[PDB]
Amino acid sequence: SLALSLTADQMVSALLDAEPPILYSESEASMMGLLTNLADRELVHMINWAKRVPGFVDLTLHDQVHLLECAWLEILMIGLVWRSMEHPGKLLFAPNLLLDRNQGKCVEGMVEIFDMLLATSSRFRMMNLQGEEFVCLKSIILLNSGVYTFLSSTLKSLEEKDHIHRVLDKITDTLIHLMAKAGLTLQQQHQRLAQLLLILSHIRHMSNKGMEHLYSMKCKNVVPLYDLLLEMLDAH
């Protein structure tokens, strides 16, 4: 229940405190070798960030896991694209790794995904996303991706299901509270809320192509065996 009392200030704080650290990085095989290794490495501070997201541990060891397996690629890119946002034309995978559009065509079908990634960064940019807004979005995305792929047969996962909506609702207030600060009309405010929320869906789409692409590169044995990353795959 703790998740539901905190306020738009109280909230946007914890979503800030939980923020993962900027992780530095380290043929088609190699390119993919590269983002896999960062991807695998981010994939731990993601877990760690998930736990410190209000309402999550409130979730269930099984639901926690399933939201993550559902959303992991989505969060990587929402974050990817955000990092990438002041770098028009580029994907700031790490600081020490500022990949470009055409560098996406070192991998089969990769450029197009990039192409999607970049456009959202554009969007987020030209829309002027703010960190608070973003931390918000990121959590929303974590909470809403696996929400409607649960095993809704146990009345314990029917508590769980409606919990998430409550949180998710709170989060949207937070966002609201946030947007009210900027000083937009209530039109422009929810004109906004609709702004972001849609993007998310383009992010699901992107995560999905992305998840297929990853799985294929697995097939060609062109991705290293990053145990954690690989097991993120093997739940789709």
């Binding site: 877990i47 736990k51 060891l61 896991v65 993550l68």
Partner: peptide
């Protein structure tokens, strides 16, 4: 049956 399962806990 896991790293995800052990890091999350």
């Amino acid at each position: 049956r896991x790293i995800x399962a052990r890091x999350x806990q």
